[PDB]
Every structure is written in C-alpha cells, then in structure tokens.
A paper describes a structure:
Ribosome is a molecular machine that translates genomic information into the amino acid sequence. While the large ribosomal subunit functions only as a part of a whole ribosome, participating in the elongation of a protein chain, the small subunit has extra functions, being responsible for the initiation of translation and for the recycling of ribosomes after termination. We report a high-resolution (2.3–2.5 Å) cryo-EM reconstruction of the Triticum aestivum (common wheat) 40S ribosomal subunit. By implementing the multibody refinement algorithm, we obtained cryo-EM reconstructions of both the head and body domains with nominal resolutions of 2.55 Å and 2.34 Å, respectively, extended to 2.0–2.2 Å in the most stable internal regions.
Author numbering:
A (entry chain F): 115 to 213
B (entry chain Q): 4 to 148
C (entry chain h): 2 to 72
D (entry chain c): 4 to 65
E (entry chain P): 10 to 123, 132 to 200
F (entry chain Z): 36 to 106
G (entry chain T): 14 to 153
H (entry chain U): 24 to 126
The structure:
Amino acid sequence: VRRACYGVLRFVMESGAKGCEVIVSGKLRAQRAKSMKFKDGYMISSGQPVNEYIDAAVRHVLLRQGVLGIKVKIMLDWDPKGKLGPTTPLPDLVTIHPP
Amino acid sequence: VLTRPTPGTVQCFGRKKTAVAVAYCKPGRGLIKVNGAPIELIRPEMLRLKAFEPILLAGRSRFKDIDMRIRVRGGGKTSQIYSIRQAIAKSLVAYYQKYVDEAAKKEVKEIFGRYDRTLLVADPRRCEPKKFGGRGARARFQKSY
Amino acid sequence: GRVRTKTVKKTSRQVIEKYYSRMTLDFHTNKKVLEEVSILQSKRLRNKVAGFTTHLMRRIQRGPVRGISLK
Amino acid sequence: QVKLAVVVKVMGRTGSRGQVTQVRVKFLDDQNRLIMRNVKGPVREGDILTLLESEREARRLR
Amino acid sequence: GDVKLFNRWTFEDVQVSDISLNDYLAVTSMKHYTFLPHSAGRYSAKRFRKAQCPIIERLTNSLMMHGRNNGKKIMAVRIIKHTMEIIHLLTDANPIQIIVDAIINSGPREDATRRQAVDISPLRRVNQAIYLLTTGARESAFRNVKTIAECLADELINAAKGSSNSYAIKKKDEIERVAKANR
Amino acid sequence: KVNNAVLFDQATYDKLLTEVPKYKQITPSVLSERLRINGSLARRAIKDLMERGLIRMVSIHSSQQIFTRAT
Amino acid sequence: STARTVKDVNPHEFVKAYSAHLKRSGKMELPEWVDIVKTARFKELPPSDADWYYIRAASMARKIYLRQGIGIGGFQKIYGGRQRNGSRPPHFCKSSGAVSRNILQELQKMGIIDVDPKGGRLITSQGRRDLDQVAGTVPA
Amino acid sequence: VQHRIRITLSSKSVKNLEKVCSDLVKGAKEKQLKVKGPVRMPTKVLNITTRKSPCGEGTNTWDRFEMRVHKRVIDLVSSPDVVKQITSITIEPGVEVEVTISD
Amino acid sequence: SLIAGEEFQHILRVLNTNVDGKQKIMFALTSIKGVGRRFSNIVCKKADIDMNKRAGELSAEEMDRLMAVVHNPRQFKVPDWFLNRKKDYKDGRFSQVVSNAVDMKLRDDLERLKKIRNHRGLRHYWGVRVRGQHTKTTGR
RNA sequence: UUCCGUUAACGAACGAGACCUCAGCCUGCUAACUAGCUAUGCGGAGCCAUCCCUCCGCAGCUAGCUUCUUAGAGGGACUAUCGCCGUUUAGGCGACGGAAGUUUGAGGCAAUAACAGGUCUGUGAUGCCCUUAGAUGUUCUGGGCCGCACGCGCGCUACACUGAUGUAUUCAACGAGUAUAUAGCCUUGGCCGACAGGCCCGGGUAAUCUUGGGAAAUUUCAUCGUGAUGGGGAUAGAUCAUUGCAAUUGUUGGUCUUCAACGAGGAAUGCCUAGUAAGCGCGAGUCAUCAGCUCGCGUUGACUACGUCCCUGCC
Ligand SMILES: [K+]
Ligand SMILES: [K+]
Ligand SMILES: [K+]
Ligand SMILES: [Mg+2]
Ligand SMILES: [Mg+2]
Ligand SMILES: [Mg+2]
Ligand SMILES: [Mg+2]
Ligand SMILES: [Mg+2]
Ligand SMILES: [Mg+2]
Ligand SMILES: [Mg+2]
Ligand SMILES: [Mg+2]
Ligand SMILES: [Mg+2]
Ligand SMILES: [Mg+2]
Ligand SMILES: [Mg+2]
Ligand SMILES: [Mg+2]
Ligand SMILES: [Mg+2]
C-alpha cells in the first residue's frame, strides 16, 4: 500500500493537481486498524471553494482480512478555460497588475 | 421651473416585520381610509393613536388636498398598524416633495424625524431562524446529567 | 472586532506601493481604481482593501508610515 | 446627610465577578473633594451618585 | 402640549426632582414625549440606551410578567391607561408626576454586594424602582378581586407619597438597611 | 375565606345609596371589598346607581370599570 | 350621519343594530335546535345570548356583504377557533356546518343573500340595500 | 402569427436556465415576434432534513438538503413552425423546455 | 341591584343533594350527580327558568318544573344524544341518570364485566387502568 | 496563531476569516392573462333619485404601469466620516449620516492529532465465527415489544380575574398535494346531519385549485367574583361515527355524564443578551389511521448585562 499510494500521488501531481491526498484505513498489516495519510501539495478543506476545487472519491477494497478504505482528494488548479479545473479563482487570491 | 406642478398621485409603502401597507394619495378633500374603512376605526383601538401620530403631528390641515387610500397585508395586528403609520408619513413626505415644494417637505420630514425615525425608516428586524437542538433560535433543549 | 486580516492589509500596502499616484483620499474613488489595477474576487473584499487603502493614504499625509513610499 | 457627587472618571471593574465599579467623584457642594467610591450597576462619567455616607471612601483596586 | 400621553395627559408640567435621577427618567425632554407607551424601540443594542426610553414605556414593559403575560404589551398599555385614570381620580394631579415621584421614592440608593455597602448608579436605581413597583402591584393583584390596574394605582400612589404602606418602599427600606447594618 | 353576599339587605341598600356616592373612586372591586358583596352584585349595584344618577362614569371597559361621584 | 355604508361603521355596533333589525323584521324562522346546539364542538356551552341566532345572522350577512363566494366550510373556518384538548396542546377547530347552512338558507328566504354560480353565496341588491340603509342609522 | 404559445422552462440551476431564456427571447426578438417574458415563477424549495448519524448516538445533528426548482414562462403569439424552429437550439442540460399551444 | 327576598333559601335540598342558594341556578344544578353544566343549561332553558337568577331566588314551583325536566328530559323534548345513559344494556331505553343512580349504574356495569371475566372488568377488579394506558411510570 | 509590536528569525501554508446560502436596503434596471396597482366603462348599494362623493363587482393581451407581489441582474458598508482614547500604532468607545455601524443578523462549510466513542439492527460494505431444511433462512396465524409495589430523564396540562367561559371582530409565514381507474392525494362548492360524519357536482400534477392559506395568542362586549370556583381536566360509564383485513389491552374522532391531584413546588439544576427569552398558533416528516415528539414557520414581544475569573470547564 505504501508504494501504490505514493504512485497515485506521483501520477496526480505530474498530471497537474495543485495538491493531492490519499487515506488508507483498515487492517493494513496488523489486526488493529490504522489510517495512513498520503498528502502532498496544497489542499483547502473549508468553505464553498471546496465544492469547486476538491475532486474526491471514496472506494473500498474487499480484501482477505476485511475491507480497506480509500479516500482520494485531488485539489484542482484554476483553469481560465474551465477544462482542467475551476474557472473561478480562489476568493482570497489577489492579483495586482504591474504598473 | 420655479412653479408648483399640478397636484398628482403618489404611492408609498411602509413595513414592519412581514406587514406591508401601501398608501395611494390623490388630490382630494382629506379622506384617509385603510382597506376601505376610515382610519378612525383601525384596530387594535389602544394602538389607534400610534397610527394617528403622523396626522396628529403634521396636523389635519396638511392633509386637506390629498385623499389617502391605504392597503395593508401581512404581519399581524401590531405590525400592520406600524406599517400604516410609516406609509402615511412617507406618503405625505413624497407628496410634498413632488407637488408642494421641497422646503415644506423638509419641515414635515424634520417633525417626523424628531418624533420617531421609525415613521420614515423601516425597522430591519426579522425573526431569527430556529436551530435544531432547541425549540427556538437561541433556546436549547434542557440538559440533564 | 473589526481587525483587518493580512490579505486586506498586504494588498493595501502593495497597491499604494505601486499606484500611489492614481490613489485619492476618498473611499469611493479608491474602490473604482482598485477595480482597474487589481482583480479581486469579492465586492466585500474589494471594499475592505479600499477602505484600508484610504486609511493608509491618510496616515501617509500625517507623515510617518512603515511602508516604503519612496517619493 | 445625602451628598450628591458627580462621577468624573471610571476606573476598573472590581470584585471577584466584576459586579462593582470603582469610580472617582467630585462632590456637588465641594468641587475640591475627590473620593473613590464603589458603584453597583451600570455607571458612566457624569451621572450623579447619592452617596449616603460620604466619609468612608474605599480602598483603591480592591 | 401637542403630544399628550393617551392624548389626555400633559408632559410639560412634570418636575423630576432628583438631579441624580434626571437623565435616566425620560419624561422632561420634548424628545421623550410620546402619545402611547408603545414604541417597539431598539433600546437594548447599547449599554445606556434604555435610559433614553420613555419612562411610562419602561413601566409598561415590566407588566409583561410572568410568562403567562409575556409579549402581551397591548394589555399592559391598557393596564397603564386604566391605572393613570385611577391615579388622576384619587390624587387629582397629573398621573405622570405621580409616577415619576413613585419611581424617585422607590429606587434604592445603596446596596451591599459581595458584605461591603455599595452605592447604586442612577440607571440601576430606576430599574430597581420600576421592578419593585410592578412586582408589588402584581403580587397584590394575584388571587385577588382587585384588578391589576387598581393595585398598580394604589402602589404608585403610596410610593409617590413615601408611605411605608407600599411594597416597593418597604423593600427599598430593607435593602438600604442591610447596607447600613453591613456598612 | 370570603363571605361576600350576593343580594343586598335593605340596610346595605341604604348604605349603597348614601355612603357609596360619597366615595371618590367607585369600581366593582372597591364596593366588593367594602360592602362585603359579590363582584356580580357590585357591578349590578354600580349599574343601578348609574340609573339613579348618583354617580358618573370616568371610563368603562371589559376588564376595568371606573366610576366616580357626580357630587 | 347617513350616507354611511357598512365599511364606514364600527362592526361591533353594526352587527348589534342589524341583529335587532332582523329580529324586528319577523322573517326569520328559528329551528327547534336553537336552545340546544353549540356553535362548534370545541365550545363547551351553548351561546349565552338568547338572540345569538340573529347576531350570527347579522355577522354572516355583513361577511357576505364584504366578500363574495363564502361557502359553508368557509364559514365553519371563520367561526372556528381554539380547541383546548385537556392535557394535550390546543389546536384550531372548525364550527358547526348545520348552523351556518340553516342561517344562510333563512337569509336566502329574505332576498338578502343569494347563491352564485361560481360557488358559495353572494349578496343581493336588496341585501346590500338593507345593510347600507341600516349602516346609516348606526350612531357614530 | 396566429396561435398563442406558452414555453415553460424549468431547471435546478439559475445560470443555465437564464441563458436559455435569453437565447429564446433573443431569437423571438430577431424574428420580430412579440414576446411576453421571461416571467419568473416563485422558486420551489424542495427540502429534506434528516439526522446525519447513520445510528442513534451522538448529538442529534440535522443536515438540511435543498433542491431549488426555477420556473420560467415565455408567452409568444405565433404559429407552431417558428416555435419549434426557435426551440431547436442547444438547450443546456438540466433545462426542461415545454411548448404548449394556446388559442 | 335586586335587593333580596324573604323566601331566599341558602341551602335547598334537591334530589338528595344540597344546592347552594348563593349560586346561579344553572351552575347550582350541577351539584346533583348526573347533571353537568350543559345538561343543567338545557334543563333551565326547557323549564323556562331565568338564567340570570340565583338558586335561592327561585320559588317552589320553579324548582318543581326544573325537576319535571330533570326526571323526564324526553317529554320536554331533550334529544336522545343528550343523555348520559343512551341505549341501556338490559332496558334499551334512553334516560338521564341522576343522583345516586349514577353510582348504582356504575357498580352494576362493573359487576356485569366482573362476572363474565371480561378484560376490562378484570382491570377494574385489579385496581389498574382500564383504557389501555401505560402503567409503568404514571398512575403511581 | 486577529493584527500590531518585541525580536535569530524571515517568508509561507492549512485552519480562522475570505467564501456560500437565507434575511435586511434599491419609487434605479429587467418583466409579468399562473401577481398586482391605477384609471376608464358598465352594473349594484348608499346618499336619496341622475350628477357628485363613498364602498363594492365585472370587463378590456389596444387602458396604462410596476409602488405593492415575484425573481434575475447589479448597486450598496468600507468603520467611511467626526471627536476622544490608544505606544497616538493595531484597535476601542461615542456621534452624524445611513436600510444597515454587534466582521449587519443567522447559518452552511470547516485544520492537525485522536477516542479500542456509536453504528455488523441502514447498506447485495465487510473479515472471522455460528446456523443452514425438525433452519438463527422465509412465510402465515396468534401473542409481546404498551405489561406495573418502585427510581430517573425529555416533555405537555395546570394551579387562575394580567383569568375562564359565551358573543362580536380580524391580521401570518414556512410548506404540501392525485394512477382517475365510478375513485387513489389536497380538497372547493351544494345538500343532509346537533356533532361525528355522509352524499352529490367539480378544480388542481399546481404564483392557475385547495389557499388572498379566513391561525391562535391578541382585541371587544358580557357573565363569572377569590369559592379547588364557571380554575384544572386526570380517571371513569354509556353511546355514536371514521381508518383499516382486523380497533380487545380502550387507533382516533364525537355526545352526555363522571370531576382526581394540583393553591406556584425542598436540596438541586437547565436555557437564554434582540425581533432574543417567553407566550401563541401553523406547516412538514413520521402516516391507512395515531403528534403531548422532532425539523421548520410566522405572530405578540420583554427584563437584565455590555463585565469577571467567584464557581464550572477548557486553553
Ligand atoms: K453499519
Ligand atoms: K459481521
Ligand atoms: K435505514
Ligand atoms: Mg469559514
Ligand atoms: Mg386580581
Ligand atoms: Mg365539504
Ligand atoms: Mg398554552
Ligand atoms: Mg418593485
Ligand atoms: Mg467500545
Ligand atoms: Mg419501546
Ligand atoms: Mg374569548
Ligand atoms: Mg371545579
Ligand atoms: Mg375548564
Ligand atoms: Mg401506534
Ligand atoms: Mg402529522
Ligand atoms: Mg451548567
């Protein structure tokens, strides 16, 4: 798992997401369950821009020891053409035209 | 340019909570009615002076050349009277501004303002939404231990 | 408590730093030019930047400030 | 007797819970007699207090 | 004399005796003259704004107790009118002056906090006066044939004279006494 | 334990017609407390004295009826 | 003075004057169940006024004067109020339909109110005239 | 032309519905047809409130879900031909166009 | 108002019950068991008895007519839906049960269920609730 | 952890705020036969006729218009201006103006790290274990989950005259609604019926019909008259209707009768700073029927404070 989650992170960041996060919860190695987060980049969590900038999924793996959880949160970049990501810039982002 | 225009019609509204009262003013003989009935009959009776305040202060002489027909809907039995109050005051102020010179408006508006700003400006207060966890906006369910 | 955050304060000083010339002492004129030399994502945030910009633009007239304002 | 003293400066919410205000007052018959008295209730600079006993004063910041 | 309470009672001839309690009873200034003890005013946003509220309205608001009478301000205004008529009948004077005299002769001036004796501010003084007056009238009316308006009139009349037959004055006396015992 | 009567006796009718018109304030409660009569009897006696013209009326209402003397 | 219509007079006085007018006219036939029934089921006593039938007739006549199209269910809602449910919270309740229907039929047997094709009841020209000519007699 | 056409438009989004309405009223005003609209009906607020907990433990916290239905009515006077020729442009997803012929 | 009467009786012995003479007649008749406020109101109207009087003000004849109505509401045209014993089990006759007869009918109705071993009769016999209420926390 | 300011830290990032939704303002804009206003015409009534005036109804996609209603776009507040305080900073208090000056109000979203927190009885999410035909599967019948010496928690109804009762009277908002089969859901109108309810014509898949949502508290008049009383309505008897396949262990709704405790509640302890508390009612979910519950809504509408670390907890 520690090698596939970092691979997913790698591919997402080369694809172009501003930030990505992976969570693996379940009986990973031992009988007691633990949660391993795999975060890299910049990720917002609160406010309305979350439901414009955060593309997220939750999937189970049906393994031999039980069910493993996967939360993948991909933070998109502001696309002026609105194809790769949101067309609206983040509210706090301010751009000053150079004189 | 510096001559009074021919007296015409104005329509002005007042508000309190969800009650809205709209006063239609036309050149007339001093009649003032609310929903067809004369204002001297508005109820509740012990809030009747509240609706009479704009007339008692501007004087019944300032209403001779206008007929006031007021339609009021919404709210309750207090907010409707407070809405009719503001509708009368704002209707007289607007009528003096378009057909009776700005100075006289200014005087009547100053009288209304020194008595009560609610006569001219609506109170922006509305019911606060209820929150789960209590039976009211702020009140919470009784806690036990 | 009406304490301005860094985003409002930082933008205010950067706008005065570059466009000191085309910045007046009036809020309503400053919020119009702020729309021409910047891209802000909210009217509420644009108003707060121009209100603090006007605030700073008057303290500059007083004489001491911790920006640069070479002039 | 009843002395009426006009508050001139309000300094501090005293008591364990802040229920009492320590204040300076110049008396109405003696504008040279400035005493620190403790007030219960909302008080501001300029309201007259009818200090019934006007000799005891109070300890500052207590 | 254009603005009169209930269009029946004049404001101009009201003399607020106490200089201390002058800016916290809103009767003298022409800005505080009202036709009705009903304003729906926002006299609670700031700390010292209830002082600029008409004093008859402050008396009226304390009648909306207890919970069974909460929010019933038109009935409270009716009680005030029927009380102000009985006051004029039994005293032959202006009922507003009787009311301001009762509120003056009822607010305790010294209290015991913590047990150090402290002096009451004018605003808390008028608040306590009104609270004691309406509380005594209400307790007199409870389970009694006498109407709340008549009990309020009797309580106000006995408090205006200074008689110790008014619940408010007896209670003011107890309060200030405990601040004399615990000086 | 109130022992208010519901019907006058002739002596109490005489006192109602003589002493009561000398009262300053006349309301059903005051008459009930003084003459030791019921509130219904008080209201009806007030109506009768208003019929014989021995009182005036200062204010009438459903809750509070206020009457006074003409003399 | 006169020249006062229904929407010029105090309703409490107009209803009292028109109930007396109706009782004087003698064109109202009262049911057997006038001294028995209650105006609604939430009521716990029959009306305490002997002329309550004429008072309610005047009330509904005035209501039909001011509005057109009121049905029997509408009048049940108009004269319905709060029901106290003992140890349970109070709710709204409706009035009796038999009383409303009988009084409205009695008022049709005077040419005061007719029934409109659009539903409910309308005021007739004679009924409008009667109410307006009684409103002028009401002292101001 | 002759008949009276009521185009009802409904949607869950305001921008798509409004730009479709703008396209319709612009096409109507190019072909010189008189158009009464767009007329905005009161917005319907479909509300579901449910306990967020999948069980009965914790603070009883409630999430309030809302679906807002926006209704637009356009009233032209014309023949069916021009109406289906106008309401044949790319109607954006979520917008429910509905044409009804009146007298 | 009305002064008094030499015949004014403070206690009137009525249907083996004591009625206060200082009480309005309608509410005074609710002292006898089986007569409530509404049945007393109907009895007072049907007997042509002033409702603004007091119990002691009435004479012998007036209470005799009140008892004519109370012991036979039917001859005086009181509808059958107005009776506390509608459609009796054994008799099948509608009647108004008053006084100790109410307790007698209660005891007989309970004995009927206590001989057939009906559930509700056994609930009565056990001293527990009979109308299907929870008994765990209330009724203690 | 909001800034200022001190400074071996500077510069950032998450979180906070920004953001989003609802509400508050706009006689500016856009537009209404599923919203209205105003005028005109006609008709009705009044006055007395007519006329005028007043109150109504109807009509006019050629009567105008958008103030009121709706809903889109925008605008609008920034503490902006003033005084004072403040290191004269960051900010605070007061004041004018202003719809709004308490980041305008209220929400939604909401970091890191946790807890053997709850849920295997939401899941055709699940590992393992048990059972699997005389089954722990499934279905049908009946019963129970409601059982009652008692203890505890959330509540409703009260203890009354600032009221109860009976007239008169007239103001909301949020929302919901059908398979048309004879008809299903919301029901208008007419008739019968004291009520309960029933019957008969219909409207509405809905700003169109229910619904201008004919809510109560409140208001008005009268009665009651300090009496557990016309306060209270528990318990109980008889009886009639409705939902349902079925109502007994009372589904519920009515009618008459019965008429308990309770006269404000010990020690304790809860919630709450403005359209708030409290009062009052309505809608929705549940639902064939059953709301004393929750989630919303509006109506009426205060007192008190503008602080403190005394208690409780957290940092
Ligand atoms: K689960
Ligand atoms: K399992
Ligand atoms: K489930
Ligand atoms: Mg936030
Ligand atoms: Mg009393
Ligand atoms: Mg029907
Ligand atoms: Mg209640
Ligand atoms: Mg508009
Ligand atoms: Mg555990
Ligand atoms: Mg259970
Ligand atoms: Mg009532
Ligand atoms: Mg009793
Ligand atoms: Mg009762
Ligand atoms: Mg059940
Ligand atoms: Mg329900
Ligand atoms: Mg606590």
